[PDB]
Coordinates of C-alpha atoms and ligand atoms in Angstrom, one line a residue:
Chain A
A2 CA -9.4 -16.1 -2.1
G3 CA -7.8 -18.0 0.9
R4 CA -4.6 -17.0 2.6
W5 CA -2.5 -19.1 0.3
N6 CA -4.3 -19.2 -3.0
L7 CA -6.0 -17.0 -5.6
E8 CA -9.4 -18.7 -5.7
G9 CA -11.8 -16.4 -7.5
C10 CA -9.2 -13.7 -8.3
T11 CA -9.1 -12.2 -11.8
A12 CA -5.8 -11.6 -13.5
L13 CA -4.2 -10.1 -16.6
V14 CA -0.7 -11.2 -17.6
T15 CA 0.9 -9.5 -20.6
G16 CA 3.0 -11.6 -23.0
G17 CA 1.9 -15.0 -21.8
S18 CA 2.5 -17.1 -24.9
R19 CA 5.9 -18.3 -23.7
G20 CA 8.8 -18.1 -21.3
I21 CA 8.2 -16.4 -17.9
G22 CA 4.8 -15.0 -18.8
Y23 CA 3.6 -18.5 -19.7
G24 CA 4.9 -19.9 -16.4
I25 CA 3.1 -17.1 -14.6
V26 CA -0.2 -17.8 -16.3
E27 CA 0.1 -21.5 -15.3
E28 CA 1.0 -20.7 -11.7
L29 CA -1.8 -18.2 -11.2
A30 CA -4.4 -20.4 -12.8
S31 CA -3.3 -23.5 -11.0
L32 CA -3.8 -21.5 -7.7
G33 CA -7.4 -20.8 -8.7
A34 CA -7.2 -17.5 -10.6
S35 CA -9.1 -16.8 -13.8
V36 CA -6.5 -15.5 -16.2
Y37 CA -6.4 -13.3 -19.3
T38 CA -3.3 -13.0 -21.4
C39 CA -2.1 -11.6 -24.8
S40 CA 0.7 -11.7 -27.3
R41 CA 1.1 -10.8 -31.0
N42 CA 0.4 -14.2 -32.4
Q43 CA -3.1 -15.6 -32.4
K44 CA -2.1 -19.2 -33.5
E45 CA 0.4 -19.3 -30.7
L46 CA -2.1 -18.0 -28.2
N47 CA -4.6 -20.6 -29.3
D48 CA -2.2 -23.5 -28.8
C49 CA -1.5 -22.1 -25.3
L50 CA -5.2 -22.0 -24.6
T51 CA -5.5 -25.7 -25.6
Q52 CA -2.8 -26.8 -23.2
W53 CA -4.1 -24.6 -20.3
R54 CA -7.7 -25.6 -20.7
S55 CA -6.6 -29.3 -20.8
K56 CA -5.4 -28.8 -17.3
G57 CA -8.7 -27.2 -16.2
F58 CA -7.3 -23.6 -16.1
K59 CA -9.7 -20.7 -16.5
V60 CA -7.9 -18.7 -19.2
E61 CA -8.7 -16.4 -22.1
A62 CA -6.4 -14.7 -24.5
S63 CA -6.5 -12.2 -27.3
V64 CA -3.9 -10.7 -29.7
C65 CA -2.5 -7.3 -28.8
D66 CA 0.6 -5.4 -29.9
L67 CA 1.6 -3.7 -26.7
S68 CA 3.8 -1.2 -28.7
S69 CA 0.5 0.4 -29.9
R70 CA -1.3 2.9 -27.6
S71 CA -4.7 2.2 -29.2
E72 CA -4.2 -1.5 -29.0
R73 CA -3.5 -1.3 -25.3
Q74 CA -6.7 0.7 -24.7
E75 CA -8.6 -1.9 -26.7
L76 CA -7.1 -4.7 -24.7
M77 CA -8.1 -3.1 -21.4
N78 CA -11.6 -2.6 -22.6
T79 CA -11.8 -6.2 -23.6
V80 CA -10.5 -7.4 -20.3
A81 CA -12.7 -5.1 -18.2
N82 CA -15.8 -6.5 -20.0
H83 CA -14.5 -10.1 -19.7
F84 CA -14.0 -9.6 -15.9
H85 CA -17.1 -7.4 -15.2
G86 CA -15.0 -4.4 -14.3
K87 CA -13.2 -6.1 -11.5
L88 CA -9.5 -7.0 -11.9
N89 CA -7.5 -8.3 -8.9
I90 CA -4.1 -8.7 -10.5
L91 CA -2.1 -7.1 -13.2
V92 CA 1.3 -8.6 -14.2
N93 CA 3.3 -6.4 -16.6
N94 CA 5.5 -9.1 -18.0
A95 CA 5.9 -8.4 -21.7
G96 CA 9.3 -7.1 -22.7
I97 CA 12.0 -7.3 -25.5
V98 CA 15.8 -6.9 -25.8
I99 CA 17.8 -5.3 -28.5
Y100 CA 21.5 -6.3 -28.0
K101 CA 23.5 -3.2 -29.0
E102 CA 25.9 -1.0 -27.3
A103 CA 24.3 2.3 -26.2
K104 CA 25.8 4.3 -29.0
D105 CA 24.8 1.9 -31.8
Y106 CA 21.1 2.3 -31.0
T107 CA 18.9 3.9 -33.6
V108 CA 15.9 6.0 -33.0
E109 CA 13.7 3.1 -34.0
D110 CA 15.4 0.6 -31.7
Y111 CA 15.1 3.0 -28.8
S112 CA 11.5 3.9 -29.5
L113 CA 10.5 0.2 -29.8
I114 CA 12.1 -1.0 -26.6
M115 CA 11.0 2.0 -24.6
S116 CA 7.3 1.6 -25.8
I117 CA 7.1 -2.1 -25.0
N118 CA 9.2 -2.4 -21.9
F119 CA 8.2 0.8 -20.0
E120 CA 5.5 2.9 -21.7
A121 CA 3.2 -0.2 -22.2
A122 CA 3.6 -1.2 -18.5
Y123 CA 3.0 2.3 -17.3
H124 CA 0.0 2.9 -19.7
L125 CA -1.6 -0.4 -18.9
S126 CA -1.3 0.1 -15.2
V127 CA -3.1 3.5 -15.4
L128 CA -5.8 2.0 -17.6
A129 CA -6.3 -0.9 -15.2
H130 CA -6.4 1.3 -12.1
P131 CA -10.2 1.8 -11.8
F132 CA -10.7 -1.9 -12.2
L133 CA -8.0 -2.8 -9.7
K134 CA -9.6 -0.4 -7.2
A135 CA -13.1 -1.7 -8.0
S136 CA -11.9 -5.2 -7.1
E137 CA -11.1 -3.9 -3.6
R138 CA -8.0 -6.1 -3.4
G139 CA -5.6 -5.2 -6.2
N140 CA -2.1 -6.2 -6.9
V141 CA 0.3 -4.9 -9.6
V142 CA 3.5 -6.8 -10.2
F143 CA 6.1 -5.5 -12.6
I144 CA 8.6 -8.0 -14.1
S145 CA 11.9 -6.2 -13.9
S146 CA 15.5 -7.5 -14.2
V147 CA 18.8 -7.5 -12.4
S148 CA 19.8 -5.6 -15.5
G149 CA 17.7 -2.7 -14.2
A150 CA 20.1 -2.2 -11.3
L151 CA 23.5 -3.5 -12.5
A152 CA 25.5 -3.3 -15.7
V153 CA 25.1 -6.1 -18.2
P154 CA 26.7 -6.1 -21.7
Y155 CA 24.3 -4.8 -24.5
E156 CA 21.7 -3.9 -22.0
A157 CA 22.3 -0.2 -21.3
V158 CA 19.0 0.9 -22.8
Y159 CA 17.2 -2.3 -21.9
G160 CA 18.5 -1.7 -18.4
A161 CA 17.2 1.9 -18.4
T162 CA 13.7 0.8 -19.3
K163 CA 13.8 -1.5 -16.2
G164 CA 15.3 1.2 -14.0
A165 CA 12.5 3.5 -14.9
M166 CA 10.0 0.7 -14.2
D167 CA 11.5 0.1 -10.8
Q168 CA 11.1 3.7 -9.7
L169 CA 7.5 3.7 -11.0
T170 CA 6.9 0.6 -8.9
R171 CA 8.0 2.4 -5.7
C172 CA 6.0 5.5 -6.3
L173 CA 2.8 3.7 -7.4
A174 CA 3.0 1.7 -4.1
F175 CA 2.5 5.1 -2.4
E176 CA 0.1 6.8 -4.8
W177 CA -2.3 3.8 -4.9
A178 CA -2.1 2.6 -1.3
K179 CA -5.4 4.3 -0.4
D180 CA -7.0 2.4 -3.3
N181 CA -6.1 -0.9 -1.6
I182 CA -3.6 -1.8 -4.3
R183 CA -0.2 -3.2 -3.5
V184 CA 2.6 -2.7 -6.1
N185 CA 5.8 -4.7 -6.3
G186 CA 8.5 -5.7 -8.8
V187 CA 10.1 -9.0 -9.3
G188 CA 13.6 -9.0 -11.0
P189 CA 14.6 -12.3 -12.6
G190 CA 18.2 -13.2 -13.0
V191 CA 18.8 -15.7 -15.8
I192 CA 15.6 -17.8 -16.5
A193 CA 15.5 -20.4 -19.2
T194 CA 13.1 -19.0 -21.8
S195 CA 12.8 -18.5 -25.6
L196 CA 14.5 -15.1 -25.2
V197 CA 17.5 -16.9 -23.7
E198 CA 17.4 -19.6 -26.3
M199 CA 17.6 -17.0 -29.0
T200 CA 20.4 -15.2 -27.1
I201 CA 22.8 -18.1 -26.8
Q202 CA 22.6 -18.4 -30.6
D203 CA 25.2 -15.8 -30.7
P204 CA 28.6 -17.2 -29.5
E205 CA 29.6 -14.0 -27.7
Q206 CA 26.2 -13.6 -26.1
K207 CA 26.3 -17.2 -25.2
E208 CA 29.6 -16.6 -23.4
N209 CA 28.2 -13.5 -21.8
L210 CA 25.3 -15.5 -20.4
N211 CA 27.7 -18.2 -19.1
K212 CA 29.4 -15.5 -17.1
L213 CA 26.1 -14.6 -15.4
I214 CA 25.3 -18.2 -14.5
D215 CA 28.8 -18.6 -13.0
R216 CA 28.3 -15.5 -10.9
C217 CA 25.2 -17.2 -9.5
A218 CA 25.5 -18.9 -6.1
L219 CA 23.4 -21.8 -7.5
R220 CA 25.3 -21.7 -10.7
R221 CA 22.4 -22.6 -13.0
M222 CA 19.6 -20.9 -14.8
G223 CA 16.2 -20.6 -13.1
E224 CA 13.0 -22.1 -14.4
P225 CA 9.9 -20.1 -15.3
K226 CA 8.0 -21.7 -12.5
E227 CA 10.7 -20.6 -10.0
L228 CA 10.1 -17.0 -11.0
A229 CA 6.3 -17.5 -11.2
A230 CA 6.3 -18.7 -7.6
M231 CA 7.4 -15.3 -6.3
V232 CA 4.8 -13.5 -8.5
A233 CA 2.1 -15.7 -7.2
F234 CA 3.1 -15.2 -3.5
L235 CA 3.0 -11.4 -3.8
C236 CA -0.6 -11.7 -4.9
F237 CA -1.7 -14.0 -2.0
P238 CA -3.6 -12.3 0.7
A239 CA -0.8 -13.6 2.9
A240 CA 1.5 -11.0 1.4
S241 CA -0.7 -8.1 2.6
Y242 CA 2.1 -6.1 4.2
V243 CA 4.5 -6.3 1.2
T244 CA 4.5 -3.3 -1.1
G245 CA 7.0 -1.0 -2.8
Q246 CA 9.5 -3.8 -3.1
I247 CA 11.7 -5.0 -5.9
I248 CA 12.5 -8.6 -5.2
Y249 CA 15.2 -10.6 -7.1
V250 CA 14.8 -14.3 -8.0
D251 CA 18.3 -14.8 -9.3
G252 CA 20.0 -17.7 -7.6
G253 CA 22.0 -15.1 -5.6
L254 CA 23.4 -13.1 -8.5
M255 CA 22.6 -9.7 -7.0
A256 CA 24.4 -10.6 -3.7
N257 CA 27.7 -11.4 -5.6
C258 CA 30.8 -9.4 -6.0
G259 CA 33.8 -11.7 -6.1
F260 CA 32.5 -15.3 -6.3
Chain B
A2 CA 45.2 20.3 -15.3
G3 CA 46.9 19.6 -11.9
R4 CA 45.4 16.9 -9.7
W5 CA 43.1 19.3 -8.0
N6 CA 42.0 21.7 -10.8
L7 CA 40.6 21.8 -14.3
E8 CA 43.1 24.1 -16.0
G9 CA 42.8 23.7 -19.7
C10 CA 39.8 21.4 -19.6
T11 CA 36.8 22.0 -21.9
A12 CA 33.3 21.4 -20.8
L13 CA 29.7 21.4 -21.8
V14 CA 27.0 21.9 -19.1
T15 CA 23.4 21.8 -20.2
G16 CA 20.9 24.2 -18.6
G17 CA 23.4 26.6 -17.0
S18 CA 21.4 29.8 -16.9
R19 CA 19.9 29.0 -13.5
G20 CA 20.1 26.9 -10.3
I21 CA 22.4 24.0 -10.2
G22 CA 23.7 24.3 -13.7
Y23 CA 24.6 27.9 -13.1
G24 CA 26.5 26.9 -10.0
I25 CA 28.3 24.1 -11.9
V26 CA 29.4 26.5 -14.7
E27 CA 30.8 29.0 -12.1
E28 CA 32.6 26.1 -10.2
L29 CA 34.2 24.5 -13.3
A30 CA 35.2 27.9 -14.7
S31 CA 36.7 29.1 -11.4
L32 CA 38.8 25.9 -11.4
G33 CA 40.3 26.7 -14.9
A34 CA 37.9 25.0 -17.3
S35 CA 36.7 26.6 -20.5
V36 CA 32.9 26.1 -20.4
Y37 CA 30.1 26.1 -22.9
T38 CA 26.4 26.1 -21.8
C39 CA 22.9 26.4 -23.1
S40 CA 19.3 27.1 -22.3
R41 CA 16.1 28.1 -24.1
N42 CA 16.3 31.8 -23.2
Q43 CA 18.8 33.9 -25.1
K44 CA 18.3 37.0 -22.9
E45 CA 19.0 35.0 -19.7
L46 CA 22.1 33.5 -21.3
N47 CA 23.5 36.9 -22.3
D48 CA 23.0 38.2 -18.7
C49 CA 24.9 35.1 -17.5
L50 CA 27.7 35.5 -20.0
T51 CA 28.3 39.0 -18.8
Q52 CA 28.3 38.0 -15.2
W53 CA 30.8 35.2 -15.8
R54 CA 33.1 37.0 -18.2
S55 CA 33.5 40.0 -15.9
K56 CA 34.9 37.5 -13.4
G57 CA 37.4 36.3 -16.0
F58 CA 35.7 33.0 -16.7
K59 CA 36.1 31.5 -20.2
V60 CA 32.4 30.8 -21.1
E61 CA 30.4 30.6 -24.2
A62 CA 26.7 29.8 -24.7
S63 CA 24.0 29.3 -27.3
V64 CA 20.3 28.8 -27.1
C65 CA 19.1 25.2 -27.5
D66 CA 15.8 23.4 -26.9
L67 CA 17.0 20.1 -25.6
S68 CA 13.6 18.5 -26.1
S69 CA 14.5 18.6 -29.9
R70 CA 16.6 16.0 -31.5
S71 CA 17.7 18.3 -34.3
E72 CA 18.6 21.1 -31.9
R73 CA 20.7 18.7 -29.8
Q74 CA 22.6 17.7 -33.0
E75 CA 23.2 21.4 -33.8
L76 CA 24.4 22.1 -30.3
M77 CA 27.0 19.3 -30.4
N78 CA 28.3 20.5 -33.8
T79 CA 28.8 24.0 -32.5
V80 CA 30.5 22.9 -29.3
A81 CA 32.8 20.5 -31.1
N82 CA 33.9 23.3 -33.4
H83 CA 34.2 25.7 -30.5
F84 CA 36.5 23.3 -28.7
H85 CA 38.2 22.1 -31.8
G86 CA 36.9 18.5 -31.5
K87 CA 38.0 17.9 -28.0
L88 CA 35.6 17.7 -25.1
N89 CA 36.8 16.7 -21.6
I90 CA 33.6 17.1 -19.7
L91 CA 29.9 16.8 -20.4
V92 CA 27.5 17.5 -17.5
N93 CA 23.8 16.5 -18.3
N94 CA 22.1 18.9 -15.8
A95 CA 19.0 20.1 -17.7
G96 CA 15.7 18.8 -16.4
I97 CA 12.1 19.8 -15.7
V98 CA 9.3 18.6 -13.5
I99 CA 5.5 18.3 -13.9
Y100 CA 3.8 17.7 -10.5
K101 CA 1.0 15.3 -11.3
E102 CA 0.1 11.9 -10.0
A103 CA 1.1 9.1 -12.4
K104 CA -2.5 8.5 -13.5
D105 CA -3.1 12.2 -14.3
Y106 CA -0.2 12.6 -16.7
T107 CA -1.2 13.4 -20.3
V108 CA 0.7 12.0 -23.3
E109 CA 2.1 15.5 -23.9
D110 CA 3.3 15.7 -20.3
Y111 CA 5.0 12.3 -20.5
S112 CA 6.6 13.0 -23.8
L113 CA 7.9 16.3 -22.6
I114 CA 9.5 15.1 -19.4
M115 CA 11.0 12.0 -20.9
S116 CA 12.5 13.9 -23.8
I117 CA 14.3 16.5 -21.7
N118 CA 15.1 14.5 -18.6
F119 CA 16.3 11.3 -20.2
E120 CA 16.4 11.3 -24.0
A121 CA 18.3 14.6 -24.2
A122 CA 20.9 13.3 -21.7
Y123 CA 21.3 9.9 -23.5
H124 CA 21.4 11.4 -27.0
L125 CA 23.8 14.2 -26.0
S126 CA 26.2 11.7 -24.4
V127 CA 26.3 9.6 -27.6
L128 CA 26.8 12.7 -29.8
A129 CA 29.6 13.8 -27.5
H130 CA 31.3 10.4 -27.4
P131 CA 33.8 10.9 -30.2
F132 CA 35.0 14.2 -28.8
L133 CA 35.2 12.9 -25.2
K134 CA 37.3 10.0 -26.5
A135 CA 39.4 12.4 -28.5
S136 CA 40.1 14.5 -25.4
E137 CA 42.0 11.4 -24.1
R138 CA 40.6 12.2 -20.6
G139 CA 36.8 12.4 -20.7
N140 CA 34.2 12.7 -17.9
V141 CA 30.4 12.5 -18.1
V142 CA 28.4 13.5 -15.1
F143 CA 24.6 13.0 -14.9
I144 CA 22.6 15.1 -12.6
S145 CA 20.0 12.7 -11.1
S146 CA 18.0 13.0 -8.0
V147 CA 17.1 11.3 -4.7
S148 CA 13.7 10.9 -6.5
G149 CA 15.2 8.5 -9.0
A150 CA 15.7 6.0 -6.1
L151 CA 12.9 6.6 -3.6
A152 CA 9.2 7.8 -3.7
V153 CA 8.5 11.5 -3.6
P154 CA 5.0 13.0 -4.1
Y155 CA 4.1 13.9 -7.7
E156 CA 7.5 12.6 -8.9
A157 CA 6.5 9.1 -10.1
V158 CA 7.3 9.9 -13.8
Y159 CA 10.0 12.4 -12.9
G160 CA 11.6 9.7 -10.8
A161 CA 11.3 7.2 -13.6
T162 CA 13.3 9.4 -15.9
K163 CA 16.0 9.6 -13.2
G164 CA 15.9 5.9 -12.5
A165 CA 16.5 5.3 -16.2
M166 CA 19.4 7.8 -16.2
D167 CA 21.0 6.1 -13.2
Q168 CA 21.1 2.8 -14.9
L169 CA 22.4 4.3 -18.2
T170 CA 25.1 5.8 -16.0
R171 CA 26.2 2.5 -14.6
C172 CA 26.3 0.8 -18.1
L173 CA 28.1 3.6 -19.9
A174 CA 30.8 3.5 -17.2
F175 CA 31.5 0.0 -18.5
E176 CA 30.9 0.5 -22.2
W177 CA 33.1 3.6 -22.4
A178 CA 35.9 2.6 -19.9
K179 CA 38.2 1.6 -22.8
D180 CA 37.7 5.0 -24.4
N181 CA 39.2 6.4 -21.1
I182 CA 35.9 8.1 -20.2
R183 CA 34.6 8.0 -16.6
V184 CA 30.8 8.1 -16.0
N185 CA 29.1 9.1 -12.8
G186 CA 25.9 10.5 -11.5
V187 CA 25.3 13.1 -8.8
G188 CA 21.9 13.0 -7.1
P189 CA 21.0 16.2 -5.4
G190 CA 18.6 16.3 -2.4
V191 CA 16.9 19.6 -1.9
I192 CA 18.9 22.5 -3.5
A193 CA 17.8 26.1 -3.4
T194 CA 17.1 26.8 -7.1
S195 CA 14.5 28.6 -9.3
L196 CA 12.8 25.2 -9.7
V197 CA 12.5 25.0 -6.0
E198 CA 11.3 28.6 -5.7
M199 CA 8.5 28.0 -8.2
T200 CA 7.6 24.8 -6.4
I201 CA 7.0 26.3 -3.0
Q202 CA 4.7 28.9 -4.5
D203 CA 2.0 26.2 -3.9
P204 CA 1.1 25.6 -0.2
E205 CA 0.8 21.9 -0.5
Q206 CA 4.1 21.5 -2.3
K207 CA 5.7 23.9 0.1
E208 CA 4.6 21.6 2.9
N209 CA 6.0 18.5 1.0
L210 CA 9.3 20.3 0.5
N211 CA 9.5 21.0 4.2
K212 CA 9.0 17.3 4.9
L213 CA 12.2 16.6 2.9
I214 CA 14.3 19.3 4.6
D215 CA 13.2 18.0 8.0
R216 CA 14.2 14.5 6.9
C217 CA 17.8 15.3 6.1
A218 CA 20.4 15.3 8.9
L219 CA 21.5 18.9 8.3
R220 CA 17.9 20.1 8.2
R221 CA 18.4 22.8 5.6
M222 CA 18.5 23.0 1.8
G223 CA 21.8 22.8 0.1
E224 CA 23.2 25.6 -2.1
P225 CA 24.1 25.2 -5.8
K226 CA 27.8 25.5 -5.0
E227 CA 27.5 22.6 -2.5
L228 CA 26.2 20.4 -5.3
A229 CA 28.7 21.9 -7.8
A230 CA 31.6 20.9 -5.6
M231 CA 30.9 17.2 -6.0
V232 CA 30.6 17.6 -9.8
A233 CA 33.9 19.4 -10.1
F234 CA 35.7 16.8 -7.9
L235 CA 34.6 13.9 -10.0
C236 CA 36.1 15.7 -13.0
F237 CA 39.5 16.2 -11.2
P238 CA 42.3 13.9 -12.3
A239 CA 42.3 13.1 -8.6
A240 CA 39.1 11.2 -9.0
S241 CA 40.6 8.9 -11.6
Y242 CA 39.4 5.7 -9.9
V243 CA 35.8 6.8 -9.5
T244 CA 33.3 5.5 -12.1
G245 CA 29.9 4.0 -12.3
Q246 CA 28.8 5.6 -9.1
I247 CA 25.7 7.6 -8.1
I248 CA 26.7 9.9 -5.3
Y249 CA 24.1 11.8 -3.3
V250 CA 24.6 15.4 -2.1
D251 CA 21.6 15.6 0.2
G252 CA 22.4 16.6 3.7
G253 CA 21.9 13.0 4.7
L254 CA 18.4 12.5 3.3
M255 CA 19.2 9.1 1.6
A256 CA 20.5 7.6 4.9
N257 CA 17.3 8.4 6.8
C258 CA 14.3 6.3 7.8
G259 CA 13.0 7.4 11.2
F260 CA 14.6 10.7 12.0
Ligands
NAP301 N1 14.6 -14.8 -19.4 C1 15.4 -14.1 -18.6 O1 16.5 -14.6 -18.3 C2 14.9 -12.8 -18.1 C3 15.7 -12.1 -17.2 C4 15.4 -10.8 -16.6 C5 14.1 -10.2 -17.0 N2 13.3 -10.9 -17.9 C6 12.0 -10.2 -18.2 O2 10.9 -11.1 -18.2 C7 9.9 -10.7 -19.1 C8 9.7 -12.0 -20.0 O3 10.9 -12.4 -20.6 P1 11.0 -13.8 -21.3 O4 12.4 -14.2 -21.3 O5 10.0 -14.8 -20.9 O6 10.7 -13.5 -22.9 P2 10.1 -14.3 -24.1 O7 10.3 -15.8 -23.8 O8 10.6 -13.7 -25.3 O9 8.5 -14.0 -23.8 C9 8.1 -12.6 -24.0 C10 6.5 -12.7 -24.0 O10 6.1 -11.3 -24.2 C11 5.4 -11.2 -25.4 N3 5.5 -9.9 -26.1 C12 6.6 -9.2 -26.4 N4 6.3 -8.1 -27.1 C13 5.0 -8.0 -27.1 C14 4.2 -7.0 -27.6 N5 4.8 -5.9 -28.2 N6 2.9 -7.2 -27.5 C15 2.3 -8.2 -26.9 N7 3.1 -9.2 -26.4 C16 4.4 -9.1 -26.5 C17 5.9 -12.3 -26.3 O11 4.9 -12.6 -27.3 P3 5.1 -12.3 -28.9 O12 6.5 -12.1 -29.2 O13 4.5 -13.5 -29.7 O14 4.2 -11.1 -29.2 C18 6.0 -13.4 -25.3 O15 4.7 -13.9 -25.1 C19 10.5 -9.5 -19.9 O16 10.0 -8.3 -19.3 C20 12.0 -9.6 -19.6 O17 12.5 -8.3 -19.7 C21 13.6 -12.2 -18.5
NAP302 N1 16.7 21.9 -7.1 C1 16.6 20.7 -6.5 O1 16.3 20.6 -5.4 C2 17.0 19.4 -7.4 C3 16.9 18.1 -6.8 C4 17.2 16.9 -7.4 C5 17.5 16.9 -8.8 N2 17.6 18.2 -9.4 C6 18.0 18.1 -10.9 O2 19.0 19.2 -11.1 C7 18.9 19.6 -12.5 C8 18.7 21.1 -12.5 O3 17.7 21.5 -11.5 P1 17.5 23.0 -11.0 O4 16.8 22.9 -9.7 O5 18.8 23.7 -11.1 O6 16.5 23.6 -12.1 P2 16.2 25.0 -12.7 O7 16.6 26.0 -11.6 O8 14.9 25.0 -13.2 O9 17.3 25.1 -13.8 C9 17.2 24.2 -15.0 C10 18.1 24.8 -16.0 O10 18.0 23.9 -17.2 C11 17.5 24.6 -18.3 N3 16.6 23.9 -19.2 C12 15.4 23.2 -18.8 N4 14.8 22.7 -19.9 C13 15.6 23.0 -20.9 C14 15.5 22.6 -22.2 N5 14.4 21.9 -22.6 N6 16.4 23.0 -23.1 C15 17.5 23.8 -22.7 N7 17.7 24.1 -21.4 C16 16.7 23.7 -20.5 C17 16.7 25.8 -17.7 O11 16.7 26.9 -18.6 P3 15.4 27.2 -19.5 O12 14.2 26.9 -18.6 O13 15.4 28.8 -19.6 O14 15.5 26.6 -20.8 C18 17.7 26.1 -16.5 O15 18.8 26.9 -17.1 C19 17.7 18.9 -13.0 O16 18.1 17.7 -13.8 C20 16.9 18.4 -11.8 O17 16.1 17.2 -12.1 C21 17.3 19.4 -8.8
PTO303 C1 21.4 -11.9 -21.1 N1 20.2 -11.3 -20.5 C2 20.1 -11.8 -19.0 C3 19.2 -13.0 -19.3 C4 18.5 -12.9 -20.5 C5 18.9 -11.5 -21.2 C6 17.9 -10.4 -20.6 C7 17.9 -10.3 -19.1 O1 17.4 -9.1 -18.6 C8 19.2 -10.7 -18.4
PTO304 C1 10.4 18.7 -4.8 N1 11.4 18.0 -5.6 C2 12.6 17.7 -4.7 C3 13.3 19.0 -4.8 C4 12.9 19.7 -6.0 C5 11.9 18.8 -6.8 C6 12.6 17.9 -7.7 C7 13.7 17.1 -7.0 O1 14.2 16.0 -7.7 C8 13.4 16.6 -5.5

C-alpha cells in the first residue's frame, strides 16, 4: 500500500450492511483494500455485495451473529482462510442501542448490549491478533461514541460499553505495539444512519437528538463517509505514528459547553 | 449531619474487611455515620467488627459474594431492613484484579472480573436506588482507578471494567439528580493495601509498581485514610454542588508525562 491508500490491504469490518459500517466498507474498498464484512441478514448482505461489486470493489460477506461466541470464532476462521492468514485491518463497528434509563434495564437487555458492543469487539480482536501480526502491518480501529465519554439520555449502559472499549483501545495500543499493530478509536457524534432513523421515530428521542445537533459547532448531522474518512486515514501507512488515540468526528460536539 | 460530618447518616461500603474499603469504613464511622459492610470471609469480618466497635463505631457486616446476583439482592434486603429503608451512602469499593495480557484472559477470568468490578457496582446501585431516594439526601461513590483512564501493564481488562464504571458514574449523576442523589467516582493511584502487597510478591510486578510510584509527584504510595478522606468529603453536605466527577487521589500521577 502507498502512503495515502490501502492498495493490497485486507480488511474485516463488522456490521457493514448499513449506516457507518457500510460507509467504512465503501471507503476502504475505494482506496484499494479487499474487504470482508458481516451482519445478521444474508439477503441484505447480498444486496450490499451487488452494489459494491458494481463499483469494482473487492468485497466478500457472510452472515454472523456477533452476540454468539461460537459464531465469532467461525467468522474469524472463515476470514483467515479467505485472506490466507493475513489481515491488515480490523474495524470493530457493529453495535446496538437499547434506550432505557439505567434502572429499567433487564438482565437480558444488559447481557445483549454488553455482548455485542464490547465483548464481541474484544473477542474478535484477540481472535484476529495472530493474523494482524502475520500481516506485519496491522491496524485495529474501534468505533466508539461521544456517549462513551459524556452523559447522553438513555445511554448509561450503552455509554459504559463504549467506555470499556476506549480503555481497551489504549491498553491494546501498548500490549500489541511490538507486534507492529496500531490501535485507535474513532468516536462519532451524530451520524445519519438507520440507527438514527429509527431513533427519531420516538418524539422524545427525536427532541433529544435535536439537542445534540444544536450543541454541534456545525449544527448538522455527519454523513457515514465523513466518519469513514477518519477510519481510512488511521489505516494509511501515513498515520504510522498514531496509536492509543480516541478521535472524535462530531462536528465539534465534544469541545462544547455553553454554545 | 452538620456541614462537615456524617452524624446520623447510614452507609453501605462493599469490601470493607481490607485495604481501601476498611479505611473508608473507619473514616465514615469516625465522622458519625452508621456503617454496614461485607466481604466473602466471615472470620475476617468478625475481627473487623470487634476492632471498630471497641472504638465506638456503629458498624454491622454480613458475608456476601458480590459476584452473585442473588447474593447482591439478599445483601440489599438485609441492609434496607437494618437501616429501616433509608440509605444515605453507597460506596462501591469491592474489586479484584487478574494480571494477564488481554489475549491471555480465559472466559472464566473475564466473567469473574467483569461481574465483581462492574456488574456488582451497577446492580447494587440500582437495588439501592429506592432507599437512597428515600433518605432524601443520597450519595453514591464509585471507587475507580487511574487504570480506568490510562494504560497500565496487565490491566487492560481491569481498566475496561473501571472505564465502564466511570461512564456509568457520569450518566447516573444526571439520571438520578432529580431524586436528590449525587454520584461521583474516586480514582486511587497507588494505595498501600493487601491487593498491593500480594502484587509485589512477584518481582516483575514489583518493578512495575515502582514505575508508578516514581511517576507520581509525591513519589510514595498513598495510605487508605488518604483515599478515604476524599470519599468522606464528597458525602459531606458541604459537597452539595459536586456531582458527575471522577476525582483522582494519586499523588499527582494523572498529571504526569515526562517526570
Ligand atoms: N449513528 C450515530 O449517530 C452513531 C454515533 C456514535 C456511535 N455510533 C456507533 O457506530 C456503530 C454503527 O452504528 P450505526 O448507526 O451505523 O448503526 P446501524 O445503522 O444500525 O448499523 C449497525 C450495523 O451493525 C450490524 N450488527 C448489529 N448487531 C450485529 C450483530 N449482533 N451481529 C452482526 N452484525 C450486527 C447491523 O446489521 P444487522 O442488524 O442486520 O445484523 C448493521 O450492519 C455502532 O458501534 C454505534 O455504537 C453511531
Ligand atoms: N490499592 C490500590 O493501589 C488501588 C488502586 C486503584 C484502584 N483500587 C480499587 O480500590 C478498590 C479496593 O482495592 P484494595 O486495594 O483495597 O483491595 P483489597 O485490599 O484486595 O480489598 C478488597 C476488599 O473487597 C473485598 N471483595 C473482593 N471481592 C469481593 C467479592 N467478590 N465479594 C465481596 N467482597 C469482595 C475483599 O474481601 P474478600 O476478598 O475477603 O471477599 C476486600 O475486603 C477496588 O475497586 C480496586 O479496583 C485500588
Ligand atoms: C442518540 N444517540 C447519539 C446518536 C445516535 C444514538 C447513539 C449514539 O451513540 C449517539
Ligand atoms: C498495580 N495496580 C495499580 C495499583 C494496584 C493495582 C490495581 C490499580 O488499579 C493500579
